[PDB]
Structure 1
Amino acid sequence: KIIHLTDDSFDTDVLKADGAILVDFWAEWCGPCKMIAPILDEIADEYQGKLTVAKLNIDQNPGTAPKYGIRGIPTLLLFKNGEVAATKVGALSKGQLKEFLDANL
């Protein structure tokens, strides 16, 4: 229940989504990203109604991340109607991700 994004399909699926979009700017060679990957799978199931989980691999899509100034990954961006509502960097736990999402929705 997670959306995989490209550079072309980032303008419509996220910025024009009209809803809560949490985008993970991740990578294959990052340690903390592999740790938050199982957590996001469960978040997509529970938050299936008031939030949408999406992931962007910065290796196959190297054009989106610079426009948001990525200084560290994993980078969670809670998009709210084409605007960045809240941003947090680093592998959050399941209890920490839940706290983040319930606060911004």
Structure 2
Amino acid sequence: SDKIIHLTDDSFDTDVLKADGAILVDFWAEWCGACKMIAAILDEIADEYQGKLTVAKLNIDQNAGTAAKYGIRGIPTLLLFKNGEVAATKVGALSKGQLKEFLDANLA
């Protein structure tokens, strides 16, 4: 958790939309079982990709406005932003290897 940005409706603009570079945002909630493994994988990704990718979390129960703005329909959902714009999304659980594939697919 030490390398994960904690986002809210009130910090999303500054921390994501105005952030230079790539940010991977995990839309989650406590009641989401699949979200638990995603979190464990994301800690490793955040560590391994330091300097190249920032990882962040947005709790959809607590920040329904942001969830609505991005059309979140189910969780987990990962949104990859580059320079403040959505570059890719992945809905539903995936393995660490699949996530690394998903990220590689988005390299310019």
Same fold (TM over 0.5): yes
Q: CA deviation at 1:93?
A: 0.7
Matched residue count = 105
TM superposition shift of 1:98: 0.8
- Aligned counterparts of 1:81 and 1:65: Cα–Cα separation in 2: 19
Runs (4+) of structure 1 exceeding 4 A deviation are none
CA displacement at 1:103 relative to structure 2: 1.8
1:55 CA drift (Å) = 0.4
Q: Deviations over 1:1-56 (max 9, x none)?
A: 11011111001100000110000000100111112110000000001011100000
Distance 2:73 2:29 in 1: 13
Q: Percent identity?
A: 96
Residue 85 of structure 1 aligns to a residue whose secondary structure is strand
| 5+ residue gaps, structure 2 | none
> TM-score if structure 2 supplies the norm length?
0.93
Q: Structure 1, unaligned stretches of length 5 or more? A: none
Aligned-residue offset at 1:65: 0.5
1:15 pairs with one of 14, 17, 22 = 17
CA distance in 2, matches of 1:56, 1:3: 9
1:61-97 per-residue CA deviation (whole Å, 9 max, x = no partner) reads 2210101111111110000112100000111111111
Aligned-pair CA distance for 1:59:
1.4
SS of corresponding position for 2:72: coil
Partner of 2:39: 37
TM-score (norm 1): 0.96
Distance in structure 1 (CA, Å) of the matches to 2:90 and 2:59: 17
CA distance in 2, matches of 1:82, 1:92: 24
Query: Take 1:86 and 1:60, find their aligned partners in 2: how far apart are those partners?
Result: 23
